């Protein structure tokens, strides 16, 4: 089962006209994922989900309620010293 | 770059010798892949900070500010704002020549058309939703009531904009216009980009031309040393080619590592601006210009 | 396992190049063997002086490869360490006005946590949640004066005009203490017709 891509000749993954989040990055937007029996697929990555803000010159949306989220952020500091 | 091929073209004779230098061939790929990976991490960090792809509303009333310049062009096949086309023309064979010897150009994970969807989103949310789309769900707010805040940010009371709006409109639009000619009439504005692209194509040329150098060996054609001379001696010759070429990769590789580390620094500067400047409003003097 | 990938990678890449540095002791480099002494005891030294070159020339190089790596990799950590000092300084010891420097949402505080050869911040960020579409106006006429909010914006749910703070919905009736006067009713684009209640006027009537 062969498919031609932008990035080259792909083999053993069924093309999918649907477009989902990029999962295993390949090249030029082609991104593969395992799920449907099952077979590796290849599809044009959807960048993001789509939204269109509902906008009019008098229209404002003010949040009535909030969350407090704790997002871990991780950074190196030092590396193993050697001589 | 394909280390075994670039060094030894189509010769097992040379290819076997390369095994006696061990992991050089492999650790170069491990090196360049580290670069090649994070390049699509850079472009990832910069452009996609936004959870969703927003798109501008069908009808444009911003209070007089004309974004048709900067917003995606609905009539181009690849939708890119009128300005961005000015850029893609300025910036620019090397198409297969490099690709002869194992110098490959891998496609950037994100196609340019995708990059133009992000920079549409970021620009679509900035216009409609103010700065709130970076902090969560985008909040539609009247653009003219956005600019009342961004004056409070800089200490100018909002009553200036509600009174000067028409004037500020023209100053904005007439400012956008000159951005075209600033790009259109001078090709040196993009030098920063143009320098990056050149230096990459530069070293590749140099890296290729190193194939034609004797490096003390009797000839630069790997087969001629095998054709003219009996192997016993040709072994020592091919060393001077390999030692020369194999070194000449580490030179190229080390350059890329160093040069990428610069871009890696410049990428964060963008991702910093993109987050602080575009998505928010910056209080850092002359960070945004 | 992945959230530490940044750290786990750094520890890996060192032991990686450390490994590869070691394996280079087993490579011929063109010389007749990768054992130093076994070249000696095989040959009379005036030949070994030649061979041991191709060992030294090989190994010495393999160091300069490994070393020049570390320097580059060191700077990579170096920039990351500078970023950690910046976050430690600004995020934890301050409150960062910078946007998305401390993570998505408006930032409240961060709690650092040590990790092997690294640091881990817990960013406590304030993210709004539930929204309600509101008709708004940038201004409100009263007597022909214009009234603008000191902080926040004039909104209404469709009848009663409320001024509220921006990042949370907290409607309040509109009085002079909410609004300051500037200009008049001609210039503003979008001003509406309303009555700004006065704290003081009732206080008089006795
Ligand atoms: C925004 O500006 C563009 C051009 O900068 C305007 O497009 C022009 O519209 C006039 C119509 O009066 C045409 O004669 C021109 O040929 C158009 N030029 C281009 C390049 O398209 C556009 O009308 C402006 N829109 C707003 C809302 O200001
Ligand atoms: C908009 O909000 C205002 C503020 O509460 C509402 O006015 C009140 O509405 C309640 C309805 O249960 C009445 O009991 C109060 O007497 C009203 N107070 C005032 C000062 O008007 C108004 O009804 C809301 N309108 C909409 C469409 O949501
Ligand atoms: C707010 O009230 C003012 C009057 O105080 C309105 O201005 C007049 O509106 C009428 C229509 O109702 C027009 O025929 C007049 O020509 C307007 N004034 C003048 C001098 O031309 C205004 O339209 C009302 N609405 C607003 C401005 O929000
Ligand atoms: C996608 O749809 C086209 C028709 O528009 C069809 O030719 C093609 O086979 C489809 N792709 C797949 C993977 O089924
Ligand atoms: C605001 O109006 C838009 C109009 O499309 C709607 O989709 C949205 O759900 C509304 N807001 C809320 C909180 O329902
Ligand atoms: C807002 O836009 C509408 C178009 O839907 C227009 O009728 C109205 O006059 C505009 N108001 C202002 C203040 O721009």
XYZ file of C-alpha atoms and ligand atoms in Angstrom:
704
model
C 0.000 0.000 0.000
C 1.872 2.989 -1.382
C 1.246 6.724 -1.208
C 3.173 9.671 -2.634
C 3.839 12.619 -0.346
C 5.563 15.952 -0.399
C 8.380 14.516 1.710
C 8.874 11.330 -0.269
C 7.537 7.865 -0.929
C 5.571 6.523 2.017
C 4.760 2.832 2.376
C 2.427 0.991 4.686
C 0.251 3.828 5.922
C -3.203 4.394 4.492
C -3.792 7.983 3.421
C -6.633 9.771 5.204
C -8.520 12.719 3.746
C -9.497 13.692 7.294
C -7.119 15.989 9.150
C -6.234 15.662 12.830
C -3.615 16.974 15.252
C -0.022 16.398 14.254
C 1.131 13.378 16.196
C 4.246 11.845 14.668
C 5.814 14.641 12.585
C 7.025 13.494 9.186
C 7.529 16.375 6.807
C 5.774 19.202 5.012
C 2.686 18.886 7.179
C 2.273 15.125 6.822
C 1.766 13.712 10.306
C 1.114 10.071 11.143
C -0.793 8.425 13.972
C -1.616 4.841 14.804
C -5.378 4.657 15.317
C -8.020 3.477 12.860
C -8.270 -3.415 12.290
C -5.923 -0.578 13.066
C -3.304 0.772 10.684
C -0.777 3.582 10.675
C -2.307 6.524 8.839
C -0.923 9.639 7.205
C -2.793 12.886 6.842
C -2.331 16.598 6.437
C -1.889 17.927 9.941
C -4.570 20.307 11.082
C -2.785 23.166 12.748
C -5.002 23.691 15.758
C -8.737 23.366 15.982
C -10.602 26.067 14.098
C -12.508 28.944 15.679
C -13.997 32.173 14.396
C -14.485 34.827 17.036
C -17.969 36.312 16.927
C -17.097 39.963 16.599
C -19.069 43.149 16.303
C -18.074 46.681 17.148
C -20.314 46.704 20.225
C -19.633 43.089 21.253
C -17.522 42.330 24.332
C -17.134 39.111 26.321
C -16.023 39.490 29.946
C -15.200 36.341 31.950
C -17.511 35.717 34.893
C -15.381 33.059 36.547
C -11.864 31.740 36.568
C -9.594 28.835 37.247
C -6.220 28.716 38.954
C -3.972 26.351 37.048
C -0.563 25.089 38.093
C 1.571 24.428 35.036
C 4.881 22.682 35.583
C 7.777 24.250 33.701
C 11.124 22.500 33.610
C 14.573 23.807 32.749
C 18.129 22.511 32.929
C 20.519 24.388 35.157
C 23.808 22.527 35.248
C 25.222 19.492 33.491
C 27.488 16.757 34.787
C 30.939 18.162 35.470
C 33.898 16.265 34.084
C 37.628 16.428 33.720
C 24.416 14.644 5.334
C 25.208 11.021 4.539
C 28.606 10.521 6.121
C 29.564 7.216 4.520
C 28.596 8.376 1.048
C 29.914 11.933 1.258
C 33.274 10.604 2.360
C 33.428 7.421 0.298
C 31.529 7.664 -2.963
C 30.433 4.291 -4.346
C 33.522 2.491 -3.044
C 33.544 -0.334 -0.552
C 37.327 0.037 -0.517
C 37.005 3.468 1.034
C 33.867 2.428 2.899
C 35.725 -0.295 4.786
C 38.482 2.109 5.827
C 35.880 4.465 7.277
C 34.923 1.745 9.757
C 38.364 2.132 11.299
C 37.462 5.635 12.469
C 34.544 4.180 14.383
C 31.626 6.345 15.357
C 32.578 9.559 13.554
C 30.198 8.716 10.719
C 27.314 7.997 13.091
C 27.917 10.786 15.599
C 27.752 13.309 12.769
C 24.220 12.213 11.927
C 23.452 12.294 15.643
C 24.804 15.841 15.630
C 22.970 17.150 12.574
C 19.728 15.485 13.594
C 19.882 17.375 16.877
C 19.966 20.547 14.809
C 17.368 19.377 12.303
C 14.992 18.350 15.091
C 15.043 21.581 17.049
C 14.631 23.657 13.898
C 11.061 22.412 13.746
C 10.962 23.011 17.486
C 11.964 26.638 16.967
C 9.296 27.190 14.326
C 6.979 25.356 16.701
C 7.697 27.567 19.704
C 7.528 30.832 17.777
C 4.496 30.509 15.562
C 2.124 28.177 17.367
C 1.544 29.527 20.829
C -2.196 29.643 20.204
C -4.504 26.762 20.999
C -7.016 27.346 18.198
C -6.939 28.771 14.698
C -8.967 31.957 14.757
C -10.076 33.584 11.549
C -11.080 37.167 10.927
C -14.805 37.885 10.723
C -16.306 38.124 7.239
C -16.762 41.909 7.347
C -14.041 44.344 8.380
C -15.063 47.316 10.491
C -12.214 48.197 12.833
C -13.029 51.873 13.252
C -11.038 53.021 10.247
C -7.934 50.848 10.603
C -7.311 49.042 7.325
C -5.858 45.569 7.790
C -6.388 44.344 4.226
C -2.659 44.943 3.936
C -1.747 42.523 6.723
C -4.616 40.096 6.706
C -4.576 36.900 4.644
C -5.392 37.534 1.009
C -8.556 35.549 0.206
C -7.727 35.572 -3.513
C -4.337 34.010 -3.411
C -4.143 30.226 -3.847
C -1.769 30.085 -0.890
C -3.432 32.599 1.370
C -0.763 35.030 2.533
C -1.212 38.680 3.379
C -0.325 41.175 0.677
C 2.821 42.120 2.579
C 4.149 38.590 2.971
C 4.366 38.262 -0.806
C 6.724 41.230 -0.875
C 8.921 39.251 1.505
C 8.900 35.908 -0.298
C 10.032 37.657 -3.464
C 13.005 39.397 -1.844
C 14.388 36.293 -0.160
C 15.470 33.404 -2.372
C 21.865 24.792 -9.059
C 21.976 24.179 -5.290
C 18.715 22.227 -5.951
C 20.325 18.802 -6.750
C 24.121 19.416 -6.846
C 24.387 19.170 -3.069
C 21.881 16.321 -3.321
C 24.392 14.478 -5.501
C 26.874 13.651 -2.769
C 24.530 13.014 0.135
C 23.866 16.608 1.122
C 20.119 16.578 1.602
C 17.677 19.361 2.377
C 14.854 17.976 4.415
C 11.474 19.676 4.158
C 10.579 21.866 7.124
C 7.831 20.126 9.069
C 5.510 23.110 8.649
C 4.713 24.175 5.114
C 4.730 27.895 4.434
C 0.970 27.777 3.944
C 0.662 26.510 7.500
C 2.962 29.214 8.840
C 0.598 31.666 7.188
C -2.331 30.120 9.038
C -0.689 30.599 12.422
C 0.298 34.167 11.633
C -3.294 34.527 10.507
C -4.592 33.142 13.798
C -2.238 35.183 15.978
C -3.194 38.154 13.861
C -6.876 37.248 13.851
C -7.055 36.989 17.627
C -4.924 40.074 18.188
C -7.377 42.160 16.198
C -10.680 40.824 17.476
C -9.906 39.396 20.903
C -7.323 41.832 22.227
C -4.586 40.196 24.255
C -6.817 37.771 26.128
C -6.474 34.927 23.644
C -2.979 34.243 24.933
C -4.299 33.845 28.477
C -7.182 31.542 27.633
C -10.317 31.548 25.536
C -10.319 34.528 23.202
C -12.700 37.317 24.189
C -14.249 39.376 21.423
C -13.803 43.049 22.214
C -14.416 46.096 19.998
C -11.105 46.917 18.416
C -11.505 50.619 19.147
C -12.108 49.599 22.750
C -8.983 47.504 22.584
C -6.839 50.511 21.734
C -8.259 52.349 24.716
C -6.499 49.811 26.898
C -3.240 49.799 24.980
C -3.079 53.530 25.651
C -3.678 52.977 29.354
C -0.785 50.556 29.086
C 1.548 53.346 27.976
C 0.048 55.915 30.322
C -1.997 57.888 27.797
C -5.515 58.159 29.147
C -8.069 56.524 26.873
C -9.937 59.792 26.347
C -7.182 60.624 23.838
C -8.160 57.760 21.445
C -11.980 58.190 21.727
C -11.383 61.782 20.590
C -8.515 61.283 18.134
C -9.753 58.001 16.661
C -10.235 59.274 13.103
C -6.805 60.884 13.112
C -5.161 57.812 14.617
C -6.863 55.771 11.917
C -5.169 57.665 9.099
C -1.777 57.733 10.801
C -2.040 53.982 11.179
C -3.102 53.288 7.599
C -0.631 55.711 6.050
C 2.009 54.077 8.218
C 1.111 50.624 6.921
C 1.388 51.837 3.341
C 4.995 52.939 3.693
C 5.840 49.506 5.079
C 5.186 48.185 1.584
C 7.669 50.515 -0.078
C 10.125 50.168 2.799
C 10.216 46.528 1.753
C 9.328 47.073 -1.892
C 11.986 49.647 -2.785
C 14.943 48.287 -0.775
C 16.290 44.730 -0.714
C 18.640 45.201 2.263
C 15.944 45.240 4.968
C 15.779 41.438 4.875
C 19.550 41.025 5.086
C 19.199 39.231 8.417
C 17.190 36.484 6.747
C 19.208 36.791 3.557
C 22.426 36.342 5.517
C 21.156 33.169 7.187
C 20.127 31.598 3.887
C 23.409 32.556 2.238
C 25.667 31.269 5.005
C 23.872 27.930 4.876
C 24.191 27.689 1.104
C 27.687 29.104 1.558
C 29.130 26.329 3.705
C 27.407 23.722 1.549
C 29.274 25.035 -1.488
C 32.480 25.012 0.536
C 31.656 21.549 1.843
C 31.127 20.355 -1.720
C 34.255 22.000 -3.101
C 36.212 20.123 -0.453
C 35.453 16.971 -2.432
C 37.656 18.234 -5.259
C 40.713 18.925 -3.091
C 43.689 16.588 -3.119
C 44.372 16.814 0.632
C 47.804 15.474 -0.240
C 46.385 12.456 -2.038
C 47.283 11.902 -5.677
C 43.802 12.866 -6.886
C 40.409 13.967 -5.635
C 38.498 11.261 -7.520
C 38.176 8.367 -5.106
C 38.215 5.834 -7.934
C 41.344 7.139 -9.667
C 43.439 6.305 -6.617
C 41.901 2.858 -6.839
C 42.331 2.689 -10.608
C 45.955 3.764 -10.918
C 47.498 2.248 -7.818
C 47.515 -1.213 -6.359
C 45.583 -1.207 -3.121
C 48.474 -1.881 -0.728
C 49.629 1.706 -1.291
C 46.284 3.231 -2.268
C 45.190 2.572 1.313
C 47.543 5.263 2.585
C 46.381 7.627 -0.146
C 42.678 7.251 0.615
C 43.482 8.077 4.230
C 44.574 11.555 3.207
C 41.269 11.863 1.377
C 39.253 10.437 4.252
C 41.202 12.224 6.971
C 40.821 15.363 4.919
C 37.159 14.913 4.073
C 36.150 13.393 7.402
C 37.753 16.373 9.081
C 36.070 18.661 6.570
C 32.707 17.404 7.774
C 33.466 18.091 11.422
C 34.355 21.605 10.356
C 31.007 21.933 8.600
C 29.110 20.197 11.387
C 30.702 22.319 14.083
C 29.820 25.445 12.125
C 26.189 24.380 11.897
C 26.047 23.606 15.613
C 27.487 27.007 16.449
C 25.349 28.759 13.868
C 22.211 26.933 14.981
C 22.953 27.944 18.559
C 22.737 31.524 17.345
C 19.420 30.898 15.613
C 18.304 29.027 18.720
C 18.997 32.251 20.590
C 17.267 34.355 17.955
C 14.293 31.989 17.961
C 13.730 32.565 21.670
C 13.924 36.295 21.057
C 11.080 35.875 18.587
C 9.122 33.529 20.840
C 9.649 36.102 23.560
C 8.390 38.939 21.378
C 5.599 36.813 19.934
C 4.429 36.032 23.449
C 5.021 39.382 25.097
C 4.766 41.846 22.238
C 2.123 40.335 19.939
C 0.060 38.382 22.449
C 0.382 40.910 25.251
C 1.486 44.516 25.484
C 5.118 45.070 26.370
C 6.244 47.412 29.128
C 9.895 46.770 28.263
C 11.303 49.942 26.763
C 12.566 49.453 23.202
C 12.162 45.708 23.352
C 9.388 45.959 20.768
C 11.129 48.780 18.941
C 8.348 9.969 31.992
C 8.188 12.603 29.237
C 7.663 15.882 31.128
C 11.256 15.511 32.315
C 12.391 14.877 28.745
C 14.282 18.163 28.834
C 16.319 16.972 31.809
C 16.441 13.335 30.730
C 17.787 14.429 27.343
C 20.572 16.508 28.895
C 21.703 13.630 31.094
C 21.499 11.313 28.093
C 23.388 13.443 25.576
C 26.338 13.733 27.944
C 26.603 10.024 28.691
C 26.079 9.537 24.969
C 29.092 11.599 23.935
C 30.835 10.169 26.983
C 30.169 6.658 25.686
C 31.217 7.529 22.144
C 34.325 9.136 23.598
C 35.138 5.805 25.227
C 34.403 3.623 22.196
C 36.907 5.723 20.281
C 39.544 3.981 22.381
C 38.725 0.751 20.541
C 39.127 2.139 17.017
C 42.115 1.425 14.808
C 42.205 4.922 13.281
C 44.231 3.280 10.528
C 46.878 1.957 12.896
C 47.403 -1.781 13.080
C 45.613 -2.090 16.424
C 43.685 -0.068 18.977
C 45.655 -1.422 21.937
C 48.597 0.832 22.688
C 51.029 -1.784 23.983
C 50.088 -4.469 21.468
C 51.469 -2.252 18.733
C 54.685 -1.901 20.717
C 55.468 -5.504 21.601
C 54.678 -6.509 18.023
C 57.130 -4.121 16.358
C 60.395 -2.432 16.976
C 59.652 1.025 18.341
C 61.009 3.098 15.419
C 57.977 1.719 13.604
C 55.690 2.240 16.598
C 56.574 5.935 16.574
C 54.829 5.982 13.200
C 51.798 3.941 14.216
C 51.218 5.622 17.573
C 50.739 8.789 15.549
C 47.657 7.340 13.883
C 46.528 6.401 17.379
C 47.293 9.810 18.858
C 46.168 11.713 15.782
C 42.976 9.715 16.057
C 42.386 9.955 19.788
C 43.568 13.547 20.115
C 41.058 14.446 17.433
C 38.307 12.439 19.110
C 38.886 14.516 22.221
C 38.732 17.805 20.353
C 35.502 16.586 18.824
C 34.144 15.683 22.247
C 35.542 18.807 23.867
C 34.267 21.197 21.213
C 30.929 19.467 21.649
C 30.847 20.107 25.390
C 31.682 23.785 24.911
C 28.773 24.152 22.507
C 26.533 22.056 24.719
C 27.734 23.970 27.770
C 26.594 27.249 26.248
C 23.243 25.641 25.474
C 22.833 24.894 29.175
C 24.445 28.316 29.857
C 21.575 30.147 28.051
C 19.046 27.807 29.786
C 20.710 28.570 33.184
C 20.416 32.331 32.409
C 16.685 31.778 31.606
C 16.280 29.881 34.938
C 17.947 32.796 36.819
C 15.594 35.194 34.938
C 12.550 33.123 35.917
C 13.809 32.499 39.431
C 14.430 36.222 39.767
C 11.351 37.606 38.055
C 8.742 34.891 38.353
C 9.332 33.519 41.876
C 10.833 36.615 43.623
C 8.534 38.982 41.757
C 5.308 38.832 39.821
C 5.987 38.842 36.108
C 4.083 41.379 34.059
C 5.634 39.680 31.038
C 3.035 37.588 29.231
C 3.511 33.827 28.836
C 6.985 34.065 30.266
C 5.722 32.235 33.350
C 3.219 30.156 31.367
C -0.230 30.600 29.903
C -2.586 32.837 31.827
C -1.872 35.787 34.035
C 0.791 34.858 36.544
C 0.359 34.814 40.315
C 3.417 33.100 41.754
C 5.857 30.307 41.099
C 7.252 27.641 43.395
C 10.654 26.296 42.344
C 11.460 22.650 42.909
C 14.891 21.119 42.526
C 15.498 18.295 40.081
C 18.722 16.498 39.167
C 20.804 18.921 37.137
C 17.876 21.264 36.722
C 15.034 23.174 38.300
C 11.266 22.791 38.128
C 8.911 25.707 38.588
C 5.281 25.303 39.502
C 3.624 28.328 37.944
C 0.375 29.348 39.592
C -1.503 31.228 36.898
C -4.920 32.877 36.786
C -6.986 31.703 33.809
C -10.495 33.093 33.194
C -13.241 30.635 32.399
C -16.907 31.465 31.778
C -17.829 34.280 29.397
C -21.026 36.153 28.630
C -21.652 38.172 25.487
C -22.169 41.808 26.448
C -23.231 44.868 24.544
C -20.654 47.535 25.330
C -19.972 51.169 24.649
C -16.686 53.095 24.808
C -18.415 56.118 26.294
C -21.579 57.430 27.890
C -23.142 60.835 27.392
C -24.837 62.318 30.364
C -25.526 66.021 29.995
C -23.478 66.232 26.836
C -20.298 65.651 28.738
C -18.652 62.348 27.959
C -17.957 59.840 30.711
C -15.198 57.275 30.433
C -14.382 54.529 32.929
C -11.368 55.003 35.144
C -10.663 51.278 34.973
C -12.727 48.758 33.084
C -15.435 49.251 30.525
C -19.042 50.226 30.187
C -21.134 47.163 29.510
C -24.749 46.242 29.608
C -26.687 43.019 29.451
C -29.023 44.976 27.169
C -30.681 47.511 29.450
C -28.772 48.890 32.415
C -25.311 50.154 31.662
C -22.715 48.773 34.029
C -19.047 49.571 34.321
C -16.964 46.589 35.327
C -13.354 45.594 35.752
C -11.938 43.893 32.713
C -10.626 40.474 33.702
C -13.608 39.512 35.857
C -17.309 40.265 35.582
C -18.263 42.472 38.521
C -20.919 44.941 37.429
C -21.355 48.195 39.301
C -23.737 51.090 38.839
C -22.142 53.997 37.022
C -21.335 57.044 39.132
C -18.772 59.817 38.933
C -16.434 57.804 41.132
C -16.447 55.223 38.345
C -16.084 57.673 35.471
C -14.143 60.767 34.527
C -15.314 63.537 32.222
C -13.530 64.449 29.001
C -14.545 66.220 25.815
C -18.209 66.142 24.860
C -20.685 63.990 22.978
C -19.764 64.782 19.384
C -16.389 63.203 18.877
C -16.593 59.742 20.427
C -17.578 57.025 17.982
C -19.983 54.692 19.737
C -21.031 56.797 22.687
C -24.570 55.952 23.888
C -27.330 57.925 25.723
C -27.533 57.134 29.489
C -27.680 58.693 32.978
C -24.671 58.459 35.273
C -25.987 58.356 38.808
C -24.436 60.801 41.255
C -23.323 59.794 44.746
C -23.580 63.352 45.950
C -26.970 64.542 44.659
C -29.082 62.369 47.006
C -26.743 63.101 49.912
C -27.837 66.711 49.568
C -31.542 66.400 49.521
C -31.929 66.572 53.270
C -7.796 49.159 2.498
O -6.780 49.527 1.598
C -6.861 48.856 0.338
C -5.628 49.247 -0.431
O -4.567 49.556 0.461
C -8.155 49.257 -0.354
O -8.259 48.562 -1.591
C -8.432 49.551 -2.626
O -9.814 49.909 -2.762
C -10.059 50.914 -3.761
C -11.539 51.204 -3.726
O -11.794 52.592 -3.559
C -9.579 50.429 -5.128
O -9.731 51.478 -6.075
C -8.118 50.000 -5.060
O -7.719 49.430 -6.303
C -7.919 48.982 -3.947
N -6.521 48.595 -3.847
C -6.127 47.345 -3.577
C -4.646 47.125 -3.519
O -6.930 46.437 -3.389
C -9.339 48.918 0.543
O -10.544 49.418 -0.020
C -9.157 49.533 1.921
N -10.223 49.104 2.808
C -10.501 49.716 3.961
C -11.634 49.144 4.749
O -9.863 50.691 4.350
C -29.440 43.091 33.468
O -28.936 43.157 34.785
C -29.682 44.048 35.627
C -28.976 44.065 36.958
O -29.454 43.029 37.802
C -31.132 43.591 35.732
O -31.874 44.546 36.477
C -32.518 43.830 37.542
O -33.293 42.751 37.045
C -33.948 42.006 38.079
C -34.642 40.844 37.406
O -34.762 39.731 38.282
C -34.908 42.911 38.841
O -35.468 42.186 39.929
C -34.179 44.137 39.365
O -35.109 45.054 39.929
C -33.423 44.825 38.240
N -32.658 45.946 38.751
C -32.421 47.048 38.034
C -31.612 48.113 38.713
O -32.839 47.177 36.890
C -31.743 43.451 34.349
O -33.045 42.882 34.449
C -30.867 42.553 33.495
N -31.414 42.430 32.157
C -31.148 41.391 31.363
C -31.784 41.419 30.010
O -30.403 40.486 31.713
C -29.042 60.848 22.129
O -29.744 62.066 22.375
C -29.427 63.104 21.448
C -30.190 64.367 21.826
O -29.777 64.803 23.127
C -29.780 62.662 20.032
O -29.390 63.685 19.110
C -30.486 63.990 18.225
O -31.216 62.828 17.825
C -32.332 63.122 16.983
C -33.075 61.830 16.659
O -33.662 61.304 17.854
C -31.855 63.813 15.713
O -32.979 64.141 14.890
C -31.094 65.079 16.071
O -30.593 65.682 14.874
C -29.944 64.710 16.996
N -29.208 65.891 17.407
C -28.783 66.803 16.538
C -28.402 68.132 17.123
O -28.708 66.576 15.343
C -29.036 61.377 19.700
O -29.423 60.920 18.400
C -29.381 60.323 20.739
N -28.656 59.098 20.463
C -27.350 58.997 20.688
C -26.510 60.118 20.154
O -26.865 58.053 21.290
C -9.910 11.604 -0.791
O -10.985 12.006 -1.641
C -10.667 11.928 -3.040
C -11.858 12.474 -3.795
O -12.028 13.864 -3.557
C -10.316 10.491 -3.429
O -9.913 10.451 -4.793
C -9.200 9.955 -2.544
O -8.988 8.572 -2.814
C -9.551 10.142 -1.068
N -8.454 9.712 -0.222
C -8.477 8.583 0.496
C -7.260 8.310 1.315
O -9.440 7.828 0.488
C -21.851 34.675 22.085
O -22.394 34.691 20.751
C -21.834 33.702 19.874
C -22.463 33.917 18.518
O -22.097 32.890 17.608
C -22.093 32.308 20.434
O -21.479 31.336 19.592
C -21.542 32.202 21.852
O -21.867 30.930 22.403
C -22.112 33.316 22.728
N -21.551 33.248 24.066
C -21.958 32.366 24.984
C -21.268 32.432 26.313
O -22.840 31.547 24.750
C -21.289 49.137 14.521
O -21.471 48.329 13.382
C -22.818 48.304 12.892
C -22.834 47.351 11.723
O -23.260 46.055 12.120
C -23.270 49.711 12.519
O -24.640 49.679 12.131
C -23.086 50.645 13.701
O -23.349 51.980 13.292
C -21.653 50.573 14.197
N -21.467 51.426 15.351
C -20.315 52.058 15.606
C -20.273 52.888 16.852
O -19.347 51.931 14.879
